[PDB]
Design a protein around this ligand. Structure first.
Ligand SMILES: *C1O[C@H](CO)[C@@H](O[C@@H]2O[C@H](CO)[C@@H](O[C@@H]3O[C@H](CO)[C@@H](O)[C@H](O)[C@@H]3O)[C@H](O)[C@H]2NC(C)=O)[C@H](O)[C@H]1NC(C)=O
Ligand SMILES: *C1O[C@H](CO)[C@@H](O[C@@H]2O[C@H](CO)[C@@H](O[C@@H]3O[C@H](CO)[C@@H](O)[C@H](O)[C@@H]3O)[C@H](O)[C@H]2NC(C)=O)[C@H](O)[C@H]1NC(C)=O
Ligand SMILES: *C1O[C@H](CO[C@@H]2O[C@@H](C)[C@@H](O)[C@@H](O)[C@@H]2O)[C@@H](O[C@@H]2O[C@H](CO)[C@@H](O)[C@H](O)[C@H]2NC(C)=O)[C@H](O)[C@H]1NC(C)=O
Ligand SMILES: *C1O[C@H](CO[C@@H]2O[C@@H](C)[C@@H](O)[C@@H](O)[C@@H]2O)[C@@H](O[C@@H]2O[C@H](CO)[C@@H](O)[C@H](O)[C@H]2NC(C)=O)[C@H](O)[C@H]1NC(C)=O
Lengths: 408, 408
């Protein structure tokens, strides 16, 4: 029985005139409350029990960290078969609190249920019911309640609390509330209408209902909330699809009509995965002179500069092998660039129909058109691969594709 | 450059008439937006680039999980030293959002700071400041702001939102707000007073400040919130110290004056360790007839029933050994219970000054007053231990304490 002294309390007696009780108390509770053991004589005869400190706890164990075991001895209660006496623990001082709850001034309406939303062309009718009672209990009538519905998206926190109310168990959520492609969530609480019984906290929020809003254009930026700070900065809370942002880079432009178009910083802050909001701090030195700033969010002119003379890649040359006296040479099909004087480095590769290109000889030289070699008894061995590169101060490019293995 | 296609885009050409570009797109973004590569001719000549799908990505790598590599070929742009052409990516459809912002109607006041609480006899002065600007910026004057302070205890959630307001940067929190021994927490937000500039969301809550409230009586029950449900039940939200509850068991009593005192269920719900709240559902069939219920929370009648004949423990008997002819016997000092006929079982124990009680012989018998034994050459050996128990239908008790070792 929870209470420690009760929990650990065993009273052993002998059919003579000696009944000992052993219980304990927690040393912590001691500095707040102290209790005295009490025996039930017959009824209003709550005769107290004398108890002296003890160190040992044999009859029962104490589940506390620091207990104050006690041993109590009580006199002849004249033992006889079927004799039961009750023990209680009386606190040193009267404890408790009271509260006169005048029903009317402490009413908490029941929570709504059967929350459902039926859409009707970019409009959502949120319906619900409330179990008032059974026999027409005139105490509380539906005309005594008020409803507070809160709604948001399956992303943001309820702290933004976009509330709405109704005197009927129905609300009309539309385009002027929800935004075009977001999945919303809403719940309802039952309040006490001004015409009422009296005060009382409103019910607890009902289960929330989820639904997708009006069809819209995804892959578009949303929530262009811009809030003017004091009198020097204007912060805007951007919002774009975490997939569009990986193909379309957007920027925040602003023009105070009656033009500048970017901010020094555009910090990205990841939202609920599916979305990534951005921020920018637009400076505003003349708030009085220019109190109109039409901000916009469109594709930022993001371009990659490619320098021709640095991103070169020549075409693979031809080879056609020549064999006079002792086969060795290799022809270089230089793609005659119109009288353009540029140095070229080549990479020729050896081989054999019995080996892979990973074990070839790569003689790399400049402005050459052939090389030397000492073959063997094979005359159907592969060994024709040539790469060209810009080995001039026309600084750089990339290895050209390979030529073709002229099986000789 | 962030955008994947831009990030992974290399365009290699040959000083002839063949420039190939290779970029990729993320398969995910594809079902939302599609982009087309574009080359910058000179200015407004944004000539598009044709691109066909590819499977290989050599020139650059794609940091995505599933990419859509593409290979694009573009014609003679007549290559010559110092020739740079820019590439961009154009989305299939115009994307963007606009917002005409009028500073006055979109003002978000700065957040308060230097939040501190000075106590003054069961009163706490909450002070704070607000950085408006530097040179007297008449746009926003302190007489344009309003303050909303919220407070609670270091336990409950802010949803209960016990709000308070002020037209000055100061609030007087007192006994009629806070409760007598709880550690509170409060924060402030800056709103726009009705006399204002215009609409705008208030600032973001400032850092919270924590402080302990007025001194009081701990080890007492608090928050006796009782709320009437519809018209049949009345729930009360109890609250007691998680230390007192282990020595003092409380109950919820109720009497509709102008008596019943307990509920069938008193469910315990652990709070912030230091406290343990309870609940009870008081039934109320006549709300109109009895709209007055004075509830109370005081020490409950928790008693442990101890049945004498079941919690027996006899007294340790004497032994005084007898040695005639051949030492063996042992005397039983039966504490003559006044002509009470009850059966007793005893436990005698052997020993020696050279051994411990864990290796003794325990002959257990009924209504005996001695036993037999064959000693040895020792005459100073310990062996006197006797327990008594109730071996009758006076059902139970506990082994009595031991007797005394009559060293014979
Ligand atoms: C239940 O009874 C116990 C005593 O059996 C109470 O504890 C006792 O509390 C007093 C005052 O709080 C302690 O005495 C003080 O001791 C200091 C020196 O340590 C001295 O400066 C003071 O003048 C005074 O003598 C007393 O020692 C302490 N006893 C024990 C055993 O700790 C306990 O407070 C009672 N419970 C309640 C709720 O009152
Ligand atoms: C960018 O272009 C690609 C195509 O190259 C677009 O994906 C294509 O989308 C259509 C319709 O969403 C897919 O066709 C449909 O296929 C199903 C069978 O799978 C059939 O029932 C339909 O009648 C229709 O033919 C098409 O297969 C798909 N192509 C690929 C390669 O997946 C993509 O949507 C475009 N991006 C945007 C934002 O529009
Ligand atoms: C129940 O609600 C309707 C409609 O809504 C609310 O009315 C105000 C309380 C306002 O603050 C908004 O929340 C809603 O518009 C109430 O009907 C309106 O009553 C006013 C006159 O007081 C009238 O000018 C409007 O045209 C009415 N609107 C409609 C749609 O008929 C109605 O009075 C509420 N019931 C009670 C008992 O207050
Ligand atoms: C600034 O606050 C003081 C005191 O508080 C608020 O007044 C109301 C707005 C009310 O809803 C409560 O929040 C506070 O009491 C305002 O002074 C009170 O003004 C009324 C008359 O309008 C007067 O009867 C009270 O006695 C005044 N209280 C005190 C303590 O002097 C004060 O007007 C507020 N300033 C502005 C510009 O509104």
């Amino acid at each position: 029985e929870e209470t420690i002294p009760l929990q650990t309390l065993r009273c052993y007696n002998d059919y003579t005139s000696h009944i000992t009780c052993r219980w304990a108390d927690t040393q912590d509770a001691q500095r707040l409350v102290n209790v005295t053991l009490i025996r039930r004589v017959n009824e209003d005869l709550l005769e107290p029990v004398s108890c002296d400190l003890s160190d040992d706890m044999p009859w029962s164990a104490c589940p506390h960290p620091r207990c104050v075991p006690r041993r109590c001895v009580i006199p002849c209660q004249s033992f006889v078969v079927t004799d039961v006496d009750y023990f209680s623990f009386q606190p040193d001082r009267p404890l408790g609190t009271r509260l006169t709850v005048t029903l009317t001034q402490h009413v908490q309406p029941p929570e709504p249920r059967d929350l459902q939303i039926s859409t009707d062309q970019d409009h959502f009718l949120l319906t619900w019911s409330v179990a008032l009672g059974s026999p027409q209990s005139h105490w509380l009538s539906p005309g005594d309640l008020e409803f507070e519905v809160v709604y948001k998206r399956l992303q943001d926190s309820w702290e933004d609390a976009a509330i709405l109310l109704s005197n009927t168990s129905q609300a009309t959520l539309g385009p002027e509330h929800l935004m075009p492609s977001s999945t919303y969530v809403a719940r309802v609480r039952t309040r006490l209408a001004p015409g009422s019984r009296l005060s009382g906290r409103p019910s607890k929020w009902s289960p929330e209902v989820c639904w997708d809003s009006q069809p819209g254009d995804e892959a578009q930026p949303q929530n262009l909330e811009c809030f003017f700070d004091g009198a020097a900065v204007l912060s805007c809370s951007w919002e774009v699809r975490k997939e569009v942002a990986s193909s379309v880079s957007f920027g925040l432009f602003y023009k105070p009509s009656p033009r500048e178009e970017e901010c020094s910083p555009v910090l990205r802050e990841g939202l609920g995965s599916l979305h990534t909001r951005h921020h920018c701090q637009i400076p505003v030195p003349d708030p009085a002179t220019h109190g109109q700033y039409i901000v916009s969010v469109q594709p930022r002119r993001a371009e990659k500069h490619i320098k021709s003379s640095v991103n070169i890649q020549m075409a693979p040359p031809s080879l056609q092998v020549t064999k006079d006296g002792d086969s060795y040479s290799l022809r270089w099909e230089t793609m005659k660039m119109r009288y353009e004087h540029i140095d070229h480095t080549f990479e020729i590769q050896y081989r054999k129909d019995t080996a892979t290109w990973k074990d070839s000889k790569t003689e790399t030289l400049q402005n050459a058109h052939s090389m030397a070699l000492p073959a063997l008894e094979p005359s159907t061995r592969y060994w024709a691969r040539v790469r060209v590169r810009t080995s001039r101060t026309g600084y750089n490019g990339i290895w050209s594709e390979w030529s073709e293995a002229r099986s000789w």
